[PDB]
Amino acid sequence: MRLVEIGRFGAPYALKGGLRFRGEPVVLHLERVYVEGHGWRAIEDLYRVGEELVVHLAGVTDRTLAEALVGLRVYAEVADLPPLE
């Protein structure tokens, strides 16, 4: 599985259920993500807050769920990545 580490989950965002995802800026072109440790997840809403990034995985709508996915790293699949152009 052609996968690569673009970012990693740092700390659990506000109760909103967000997760601080620190990865390359190329993530702004991605759609889904992979939680190295549990299972694959999807992106619903993310944005670079100041000097960091907070990605909101699908389903995670509580500090509990988020915390569970805290500390693990995120992987990407070129399959989605853009072409040479």
Domain boundaries, the chain: 1-85
- Count of CB atoms situated within 10 Å of the CB of 22: 19
CB 12 within 8 A of CB 66: yes
CB 27 within 8 A of CB 53: yes
Q: How was this structure determined?
A: NMR
CA 74 and chain centroid, separation = 6
CB 11 within 8 A of CB 80: no
* Candidates 1.10.30.50, 2.40.30.60, 2.60.120.260, 3.20.20.10; CATH matching 1-85: 2.40.30.60
Coil vs helix vs strand at 27:
helix
The C-alpha atoms of residue 38 and residue 10 are separated, in whole angstroms, by 16
CA 25 and chain centroid, separation = 12
